[PDB]
Design a protein around this ligand. Structure first.
Ligand code: CO
Lengths: 216, 150, 216, 150
């Protein structure tokens, strides 16, 4: 019943807080909504450096509200030249029915929360994902992410259609890192990723030996 | 449409079910079926995920692993069972997707292609034994359906 | 040579400052760029409540830079339940040529700068312009703007195409105000306006006697 | 194209001219033409406004009054003339749009339809008398072309 307005959140480190719109889409009953944050290892945190308010709130049927994300002083301890990963959680508490022998479902929404320090703030629609490099190796590719942002790769094939629809085990590369993915070899590999807006652009790559980089 | 406008993002899915309480009626404790060595009757329940453009040209968020779903609850007798609350004793819950994959508490469900091109996730539950003496009585269970977004 | 990244600016009163990207599009010569603010009556202000930095800066050929807008403490004195109008100015100073008998052109860009207090902050693509009301009178219409925002009307005709292309003397309505516009009578008047993004949406109106309101 | 993306706004126009110095050569002081009671020869100069999608389906920012242009400078002898700098004496400047409308310092130019569907604003200037004794010599003038956005 309770839903969130986005599939990922980017916290602009140049501001003190931001808000996320939530909504009880059930127009008959009231639902409660709890929110909390988790660190990069999906472990719950309560005292900072990022807090969510309110932790719990009642939503009347069809009601709209929001959850505010704010930082504590300790936020400054995070790296300022790369993103830091957190997770935002919105779990509903359905109205208690006293029906016998029933099962009740409570939705929990968990999205990535990227803390993006001011030094690497981006302009709307900026594209850094085109800096990825694919290195052919046994079994597939070793993808390199030299950028200061997390990059979520959702597709990799021999064509655009294949990158968007081909079966691929989603993987997320931390800033300045590299990971290996099992994959068939592709003459001109195409790669798809998820951007800040929940969109899925496709990138065209060109190879030279075992090293592939984005079409200039 | 408009060449110039504000930020537009994909919202997260909102879960909907036939019942406004997001409840699945399990029926009286199937003692007869249980004692005979079987499991109680199956109860279907569909979870519709809306407002998130769940379906795309050649796939959907679930099948393509863009979202990962998990049933959260208390493990029962075996990893393939969920514990139940209430007066009743000797019974556990079991959940399976449209291909027979049995859900394990806190363990992600395997991505699989959907059928009917419906914008919904269909599951089936049934009551099973937990290795304890059967004791009829009302039972209850609140399960968390967790959607992790990639 | 020097250009600005937008045709209007909205200063979110919930933040302390914002930046505007500028650019020397001349790839051969260096141009200087001065920036300043003006109040609602287009009179220059220098000490606040809104300041532009830097006031002057040198831009190498093809160079990109920006101007930052920030508020002073006096900003709090402005109304918090409606927008306040300012103007942002970017005037270039072309490189001095010492050629005889010449005329040199220096572009000056002047855009509206809407200070939007936190209490009336808006969500992306929010539409309040559909709250306008048209009242038929001698010569044309008396347009009412009951909203807390400035509304710039650029079109008014008997059809969508007429609203977008018809000849119309652009007018801007201050928050909570009304103005009269000379116009022919239209059975189902259509009105066009300019939004925060520089876009020009069209609104469909329905009349009842002399009072017309947006199609429900 | 993309259904989900960041804010996209119409940028302001960037002014471009044939000369990298954004200069118009006026030629030697036309004493002959002046003394004869005429004005110096005409010099055309086009101002191209780019990057702002100047042209639309059935119009353009200028003709539709979406932007207003004004020539800023020092008033000369009459409101229809601009003062000139330099050694020369006895001369003023005059600017006119494609229909003969003479620009007045700090006064907005009238909106008019454009010809050729070109994404440019074309003006014509010429030297005129200012009611003072003619004194040949180099002259100069920096004029501001102000674009106010609605
Ligand atoms: Co768009």
């Amino acid at each position: 019943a309770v839903s969130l307005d986005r599939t990922r959140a980017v916290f602009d480190g140049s501001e003190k807080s931001m808000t996320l719109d939530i909504s009880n889409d059930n127009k008959q009953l009231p639902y409660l909504a709890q929110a909390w944050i988790e660190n990069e290892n999906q472990e719950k945190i309560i005292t900072g450096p990022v807090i969510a308010t309110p932790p719990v709130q009642r939503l009347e049927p069809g009601a709209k509200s929001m959850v505010r994300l704010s930082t504590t002083p300790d936020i400054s301890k995070l790296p300022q030249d790369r993103e830091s990963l957190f997770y935002f959680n919105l779990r509903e508490i359905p109205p208690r029915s006293e029906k016998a022998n029933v099962l009740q479902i409570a939705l929990q929404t968990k999205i990535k929360l990227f803390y993006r320090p001011a030094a690497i703030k981006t302009r709307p629609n900026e594209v850094w994902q085109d800096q990825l490099i694919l290195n052919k190796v046994s079994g597939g590719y070793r993808i390199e992410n030299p950028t200061p942002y997390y990059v979520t790769v959702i597709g990799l094939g021999g064509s655009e259609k294949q990158a968007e629809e081909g079966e691929f085990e989603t993987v997320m590369l931390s800033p300045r890192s590299e990971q290996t993915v099992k994959s068939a070899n592709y003459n001109t590999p195409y790669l798809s990723y998820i951007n800040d807006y929940g969109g899925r652009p496709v990138l065209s790559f060109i190879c030279n030996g075992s090293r592939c980089s984005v079409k200039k | 449409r408009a060449a110039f406008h504000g930020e537009v993002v994909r919202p997260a899915c909102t879960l909907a079910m036939e019942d406004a309480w997001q409840i699945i009626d399990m029926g009286e404790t199937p003692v007869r079926d249980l004692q005979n060595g079987f499991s109680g009757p199956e109860r279907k329940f569909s979870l519709r995920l809306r407002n998130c453009e769940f379906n795309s040209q050649g796939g959907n968020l679930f099948s393509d692993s863009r979202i990962r779903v998990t049933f959260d609850g208390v493990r029962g007798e075996t990893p393939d069972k969920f514990n139940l609350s209430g007066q009743a004793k000797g019974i556990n819950l079991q959940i399976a997707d449209v291909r027979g994959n049995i859900a394990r508490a806190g363990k992600v469900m395997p991505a699989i292609p959907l059928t009917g091109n419906e914008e919904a996730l269909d599951y089936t539950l049934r009551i099973v034994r937990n290795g304890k003496k059967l004791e009829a009585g009302n039972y209850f269970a609140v399960l968390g359906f967790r959607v992790d977004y990639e």
